Amino acid sequence: GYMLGSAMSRPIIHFGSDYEDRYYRENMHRYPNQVYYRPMDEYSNQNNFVHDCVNITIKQHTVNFTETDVKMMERVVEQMCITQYERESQA
Ligand SMILES: [Cl-]
């Protein structure tokens, strides 16, 4: 029973690796702009929410993708899952 959030903008994250900084700029459109999540009411801890959200969002979006893609999406979808938590908090 994982819901799917509405579209949001993909963040722009900068990486220490010059390769990865640039890889992200070019490929960022290949990554989710929505996130899967179990509902905020089933968690006391945002860390568990985000962790779940990242795991499911990245599975659903691969169930095409490099190892580098998965580092990218780990940092970037976390940040989107945090945004989504913010969305549910406000509500
Ligand atoms: Cl996480």
Curated annotation (Swiss-Prot):
It is found in: Cell membrane; Golgi apparatus. This protein is produced by a bicistronic gene which also produces the alternative prion protein/AltPrP (AC F7VJQ1) from an overlapping reading frame. Monomer and homodimer. Has a tendency to aggregate into amyloid fibrils containing a cross-beta spine, formed by a steric zipper of superposed beta-strands. Soluble oligomers may represent an intermediate stage on the path to fibril formation. Copper binding may promote oligomerization. Interacts with GRB2, APP, ERI3/PRNPIP and SYN1. Mislocalized cytosolically exposed PrP interacts with MGRN1; this interaction alters MGRN1 subcellular location and causes lysosomal enlargement. Interacts with KIAA1191. Interacts with ADGRG6. Glycans are attached at residues 55, 64. It is linked to PrP is found in high quantity in the brain of humans and animals infected with neurodegenerative diseases known as transmissible spongiform encephalopathies or prion diseases, like: Creutzfeldt-Jakob disease (CJD), fatal familial insomnia (FFI), Gerstmann-Straussler disease (GSD), Huntington disease-like type 1 (HDL1) and kuru in humans; scrapie in sheep and goat; bovine spongiform encephalopathy (BSE) in cattle; transmissible mink encephalopathy (TME); chronic wasting disease (CWD) of mule deer and elk; feline spongiform encephalopathy (FSE) in cats and exotic ungulate encephalopathy (EUE) in nyala and greater kudu. One of its GO terms (cellular component) is dendrite. It comes from Homo sapiens. The chain holds residues 127 to 224 of 253 of the full protein. Changing residue 45 to S: In schizoaffective disorder. GO terms for biological process: cellular response to amyloid-beta; cellular response to copper ion; cellular response to xenobiotic stimulus; dendritic spine maintenance; intracellular copper ion homeostasis; intracellular signal transduction; learning or memory; long-term memory. The normal, monomeric form, PRPN(C), has a mainly alpha-helical structure. Misfolding of this form produces a disease-associated, protease-resistant form, PRPN (Sc), accompanied by a large increase of the beta-sheet content and formation of amyloid fibrils. These fibrils consist of a cross-beta spine, formed by a steric zipper of superposed beta-strands. Disease mutations may favor intermolecular contacts via short beta strands, and may thereby trigger oligomerization. Disulfide bonds join 53-81. The keyword Transport does not apply. One of its GO terms (molecular function) is ATP-dependent protein binding. Belongs to the prion family. Keywords: Amyloid, Amyloidosis, Cell cycle, Cell membrane, Copper, Disease variant, Disulfide bond, Glycoprotein, Golgi apparatus, GPI-anchor, Growth arrest, Lipoprotein, Membrane, Metal-binding, Prion, Repeat, Signal, Zinc. The glycosylation pattern (the amount of mono-, di- and non-glycosylated forms or glycoforms) seems to differ in normal and CJD prion. This is Major prion protein. Its primary physiological function is unclear. May play a role in neuronal development and synaptic plasticity. May be required for neuronal myelin sheath maintenance. May promote myelin homeostasis through acting as an agonist for ADGRG6 receptor. May play a role in iron uptake and iron homeostasis. Soluble oligomers are toxic to cultured neuroblastoma cells and induce apoptosis (in vitro). Association with GPC1 (via its heparan sulfate chains) targets PRNP to lipid rafts. Also provides Cu(2+) or Zn(2+) for the ascorbate-mediated GPC1 deaminase degradation of its heparan sulfate side chains. Changing residue 65 to S: In GSD; atypical form with neurofibrillary tangles. Changing residue 84 to R: In GSD; with neurofibrillary tangles.
